């Protein structure tokens, strides 16, 4: 509810001291956006050389272990991606200490709607709600100034009728789907441009941030291109090349493709594993696989030349890469492939597509790495976080490729198993919504991570619906290996075929909390996201039955 620059000067005044400082910025959690945000944030701190702690939090339940344990001198705290949904004032408590409260916890979140207790009643925040939903948002505005603090019998009856009158519309709010408005990174950059830093790798961090989520919607991002492209116009390494030159040597616009790993993998394998194209061409089917080859017969690209790594393909095919696709792809309905994208060239190393980089980092997060076992695993993910954090750095590229050799493999897993599902037609159309469960599969170790099931769930909800009449219906998935029937189950959102009228607001967040409040059968919201929960095989089936009814949508 504040100016970004002024919130900045506040976090400046409470910061620098002897001993320095102290602030812990919480990077959270598994979302690439977090990295994108906190890296340019951390670089900004290093600019004024302000000491910082930075914590890799996984579990939402895990945050309590930290904040309740170690705090001493820390008068100014910062947090990322948490608290937009569940309020930490009740969750942490707080317990006001010393107006002009000593500690300011900044909470940065893209999630909506905000918790009601957060924005109004200033204690721990210093909210980041600005500027996306301001709004009004008159529904939260009347939620308090009316409620607080609230012949005489008719005035009591009138008063109470008014109270429930506000409580109904208030109940409409805060019970709703969790949907990201704008990427937190973008706003950190809006905060950053007011201070005056135009830095190139910074901007690349923004591009990374925005393009973190294009796998899932945009939704506003379709109109974020002005806010990026203009900035790309606010700077330039040289008016003209001047090949290369070995330095600056920076990012530029190119006809990029939702196509998967075009530059770091072989072309044919790049269609065959791509996510958008899995769908339209029915590639899980042997009968459709051929249709790809017909694409190549249309392009005049040899099959043998399609099998070869993209660095080494002939030059003629490169110069025709932006034409041939226009000549052909239009006929297959694949006409939405070509985006205007961002590509940063490091020169003699190669170039990297904005999206593919994100595929590298995601790749890093799950691989390349009774409560003791889950804690130890979540711990392994915590360590792995930094292995992924390092790849963002420019000076070490040598491990970034270790991401990509993984990012390929994962797909080779994901695709494979994905097909293993469609052969058995495991989709349960049900009535109100679509649902699935993986009872058996190869290498569930890869599927342990929330984000792995976010991407498999994504290629699957993308595959089932082209569309593909009728009625985009949200999907459900489940997997188990070890940790005694943890059976991780993540919520999902429907995918429109590039024509998106409504955000549609994932409802699993609410539907799960209704069940935690009913019989709560081995239901665990331990994962940071409201869409993803844990379950046991003993209680999963009654849970599934209680999921089927009553349907909130």
């Amino acid at each position: 509810i504040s100016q970004f620059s002024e919130a900045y000067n506040k976090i400046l005044r409470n910061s620098s001291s002897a001993s320095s400082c102290q602030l812990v910025i919480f990077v959270s959690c598994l979302n690439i956006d977090a990295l994108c945000a906190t890296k340019m944030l951390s670089l900004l701190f290093k600019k004024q050389l302000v000491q910082s702690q930075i914590v890799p939090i996984f579990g939402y339940s895990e945050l309590r272990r930290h904040y309740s344990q170690l705090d001493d001198n820390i008068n100014s705290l910062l947090l990322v991606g948490f608290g937009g949904v569940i309020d930490l004032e009740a969750f942490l408590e707080i317990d006001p200490q010393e107006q002009s409260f000593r500690r300011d916890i900044y909470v940065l979140d893209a999630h909506r709607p905000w918790n009601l207790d957060n924005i109004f009643g200033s204690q721990i925040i210093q909210c980041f709600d600005d500027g996306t939903v301001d709004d009004t948002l008159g529904e939260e505005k009347e939620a308090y100034y009316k409620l607080l603090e609230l012949n005489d019998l008719s005035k009591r009856k009138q008063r109470k009728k008014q109270i429930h009158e506000y409580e109904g519309v208030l109940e409409e709010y805060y019970s709703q789907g969790t949907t990201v408005v704008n990427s937190i990174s973008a706003q950190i950059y809006s905060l950053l441009s007011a201070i005056g830093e135009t830095n190139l790798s910074n901007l690349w961090l923004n591009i990374l941030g925005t393009t973190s989520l294009d796998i899932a919607y945009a939704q506003v991002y379709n109109r974020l291109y002005p806010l990026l492209q203009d900035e790309v116009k606010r700077l330039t390494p040289s008016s003209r090349n001047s090949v290369k030159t070995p330095d600056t040597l920076t990012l530029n616009i190119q006809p990029d493709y939702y196509l998967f790993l075009l530059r770091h993998s072989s072309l044919y394998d790049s269609f065959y594993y791509s996510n958008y194209v899995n769908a339209k061409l029915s590639l899980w089917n042997e009968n459709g696989k051929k249709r790809l080859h017909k694409m190549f017969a249309r392009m005049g690209i040899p099959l043998s030349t399609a099998q070869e790594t993209w660095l080494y393909m002939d030059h003629s095919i490169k110069r025709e890469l932006g034409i041939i696709f226009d000549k052909n792809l239009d006929r297959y309905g694949l006409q939405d492939i070509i985006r205007d994208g961002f590509v940063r060239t490091l020169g003699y190393r190669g170039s990297i597509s904005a999206s593919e980089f994100v595929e590298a980092l995601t790749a890093l997060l799950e691989v390349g790495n009774s409560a003791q076992k889950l804690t130890n695993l979540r711990k392994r993910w915590v360590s792995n976080f930094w292995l992924s954090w390092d790849a963002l750095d420019d000076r070490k590229v040598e491990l970034l490729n270790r991401g990509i050799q993984l990012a390929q493999d994962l797909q080779r897993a994901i695709f494979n198993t994905g097909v293993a599902i469609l052969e058995k037609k495991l989709i349960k159309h049900l009535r109100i919504y679509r649902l699935c469960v993986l009872q058996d599969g190869p290498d569930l170790d890869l599927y342990r991570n929330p984000l792995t099931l976010l991407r498999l769930g994504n290629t699957l909800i993308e595959c089932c619906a082209e569309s593909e009449d009728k009625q985009l219906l949200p999907m459900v998935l489940a997997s188990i290996d070890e940790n005694t029937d943890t059976y991780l189950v993540a919520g999902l959102t429907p995918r429109y075929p590039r024509g998106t009228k409504k955000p549609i607001l994932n409802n699993f967040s609410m539907a799960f909390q209704q069940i935690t409040a009913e019989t709560d059968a081995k239901v665990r919201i331990d994962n940071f996201e409201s869409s993803i929960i844990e379950i046991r095989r003993e209680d999963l089936s009654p849970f599934l039955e209680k999921l089927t009814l009553s349907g909130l949508l």
Binding site: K294, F296, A297, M299, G300
Partner: protein
């Protein structure tokens, strides 16, 4: 001979719009097959060629040598109209 060129004008007609088993041109589907497989062997049944005309079948039992060279260039023409490419393939 140049007269033989006119023969091509006939055999191309045999190459695409010829049908059998209630529609669904077979040789069109072979060209489509390679085609995708791009195995560069187009395959023509002698039964059908002899079914349309015995005059060409007689040319196969007299002088296959130069006639295959006349024929396969036209096959390349048919693949050319069906897939406006393979100037780069074979």
């Amino acid at each position: 001979p140049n007269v033989s060129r006119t023969i091509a004008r006939e055999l191309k007609s045999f190459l695409l719009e010829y049908t059998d088993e209630t529609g669904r041109s077979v040789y069109g589907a072979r060209i489509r097959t390679l085609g995708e497989m791009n195995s560069e062997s187009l395959e023509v049944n002698y039964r059908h060629l002899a079914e349309s005309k015995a005059i060409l079948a007689l040319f196969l039992a007299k002088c296959p040598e130069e006639m295959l060279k006349i024929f396969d260039l036209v096959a390349m023409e048919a693949t050319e109209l069906h897939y406006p490419d393979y100037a780069r393939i074979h």
